[PDB]
Structure 1
């Protein structure tokens, strides 16, 4: 009405499950071992941004 306030957005990101073929250049294990550190870094930067 008049003040400053924060309002959340609980947006749910739709996921196209797979590409029509979805080739791998790597193995199914190496890709996860190289991907989950990336999501770890993303979550750490989010826990710094929202904390800040």
Structure 2
């Protein structure tokens, strides 16, 4: 209209099961221990910018 609204679609993306042949140089009980700080930072930045 003459005014604005919000457009939010729950955008999904695939589970690629990325590769069976991809090798874990850091022992996938160990790489997740550092991957999870990244999930924390991404969630906190998405919340920060959603608040803004």
Shared fold, TM over 0.5 = yes
Residue 38 (structure 1) aligns with:
38
Alignment of 1:1-52 (within 5 A): 1-52=1-52
Q: CA deviation at 1:15?
A: 2.0
How many angstroms apart in 2 are the aligned matches of 1:43 and 1:7? 20
Structure 2's unaligned 5+ residue stretches are none
Count of aligned residue pairs for this structure pair: 52
RMSD (Å) for aligned C-alpha atoms: 1.2
Structure 1: runs of 5+ lacking an equivalent: none
Q: TM-score, normalised by structure 1?
A: 0.85
Runs of 4+ in 1 over 6 A off after TM superposition: none
